[PDB]
C-alpha cells in the first residue's frame with residue numbers, strides 16, 4: 069500500500085519581522101519511507117538545515133520534521149519542497165505566517 | 168485506571184536504500200517524549216534531550232545498545248529471506264513494550280507489520296509467534312531456527328521492560344512530571360468570497376493532550392479543523408481554523424484546556 073505525504077509549515081515562536089526564530093516543515097502519514105525534503109528562501113535551496121529522526125505511529129505510517137534558524141522580513145518568501153513516489157512532480161508549499 | 172505510563176520501542180528496516188536511509192533504525196519513548204535513538208550506520212544507542220542529564224546505573228546505556236543490536240540482526244535477515252522467495256522490495260516494522268501491574272509486574276505488547284499491514288504477533292508467556300499469511304510462515308520459521316531467540320525476546324518483555332520503567336519513574340521523576348501550558352495567539356485573515364478565516368494557535372506545550380473550543384459572544388460554537396505537530400525541542404505546537412462571516416470577527420474568542428493550566432484560558436484577537 070502507498071500513502072501520499074501530508075505537508076505542514078510553521079514557526080516555533082509567534083513570528084515578528086526582524087526577530088530571530090526557527091522555521092519547521094512537518095511531513096507525515098506517508099509510505100514508503102523513501103523521501104526528499106528541502107527548505108527554500110525566495111526559490112533557492114537553503115544550505116545546512118536540520119532533520120529529526122524518522123519515526124511512525126499506531127497505524128504504521130511514517131513522520132519526520134525539517135527545521136532551521138531564520139529571521140523573517142516583509143519581503144522574503146519561505147517554502148518547503150518534497151519528492152516522493154506517489155507524486156507526479158515535486159510539491160512546493162509556502163509558509164503561512166498565521167499557523 | 169490512573170494515567171498508566173507506557174514504555175515503547177519503534178523498530179524498522181528496508182531494502183531500498185536509494186534515498187540514503189540506513190538499513191535498520193529505532194527510537195524509544197516514555198509516554199509522549201523520546202528518550203532514546205539508534206541506527207545501523209552508528210552502532211550505538213544514545214539518550215535524547217533532558218535524558219542526557221539523568222543519573223543512571225553505569226551499565227544502563229550499554230545494555231540498551233546490546234538488546235537493540237540483537238533485534239537488528241533478526242530484522243535484516245528476515246528481509247533477505249523474503250527477497251529470495253518473492254519479487255519486490257520490503258519494509259518491516261515492529262512495536263514492542265510494556266506497562267506496570269499493581270504488584271509491579273509486567274503487562275506486555277508485541278506486534279509486527281510488513282509493507283504497511285499487521286501480519287504477526289508474539290506471546291512472551293508461551294514463546295510463540297502467530298499470524299495468518301504466507302509471509303508469517305516465512306519469517307516465523309526463520310526466527311525459530313534458534314531457541315535462544317524466543318527466550319531472549321521473552322526476557323526483554325517480562326523482566327527488562329518493567330525494570331527500566333520502575334527505574335525511570337525513580338531517577339527521572341522530574342522529567343516525567345512535566346506539565347507546561349501553551350503560549351497562545353488568535354488571528355484573522357481573508358478567506359473565500361465574503362469570509363474570513365480565524366486561526367487559534369498554541370505554542371510550546373507538554374503533554375500533547377489539548378482541547379480547543381471557539382466561543383461566540385461567550386457561548387460554545389464549535390471546535391474547528393485542528394491538528395498538531397512536534398515543535399523541534401520536545402514540546403508541541405497546534406492550531407485550529409474556523410470560517411466566519413467577513414466583518415463579524417470581533418464577536419469570537421478561543422478557549423483551551425490543558426493539564427498545565429489551573430483552569431480554561433480564554434484568548435482574544
Ligand SMILES: *[C@@H]1O[C@H](CO[C@H]2O[C@@H](C)[C@@H](O)[C@@H](O)[C@@H]2O)[C@@H](O[C@H]2O[C@H](CO)[C@@H](O[C@@H]3O[C@H](CO[C@H]4O[C@H](CO)[C@@H](O)[C@H](O)[C@@H]4O[C@@H]4O[C@H](CO)[C@@H](O[C@@H]5O[C@H](CO)[C@H](O)[C@H](O)[C@H]5O)[C@H](O)[C@H]4NC(C)=O)[C@@H](O)[C@H](O)[C@@H]3O)[C@H](O)[C@H]2NC(C)=O)[C@H](O)[C@H]1NC(C)=O
Nearest residue numbers: 074358359362363364365391392393394407408409410411
Ligand atoms: C475544514 O476541513 C474540511 C474537510 O477537511 C478536508 O477536506 C478535504 C476536501 C481536503 O481539503 C483535506 O485537506 C481537508 O483536511 C474542508 O473541506 C472543504 O473544502 C474542500 C476544498 O474545497 C472541499 O473539497 C475539495 O473539492 C475539490 C474539487 O476539485 C476541483 O478543484 C480542485 C481545486 O480546489 C482541483 O485541484 C481539482 O482538480 C478540481 O478542479 C476543477 O476540476 C473541474 C473538472 O475537471 C474543472 O471544471 C471544468 O472546467 C472547464 C474549463 O477548464 C469547463 O468549465 C468545464 O465545464 C468544467 O467542468 C475546473 O476547471 C477545475 N478547477 C480548477 C481550479 O482547476 C478537490 O480537488 C479538493 O481536493 C477537495 O476535495 C470539501 O468537500 C469541503 N468539505 C466538505 C465536508 O465538503 C473545509 O474547507 C475546512 N474548513 C476550513 C475553515 O478550513
Ligand SMILES: *[C@@H]1O[C@H](CO)[C@@H](O)[C@H](O)[C@H]1NC(C)=O
Nearest residue numbers: 268269270271272333336337
Ligand atoms: C511496587 O513498588 C512500590 C514503589 O516502590 C512499592 O511501594 C511497592 O511495595 C512495590 N510492590 C507492591 C506490591 O506494591
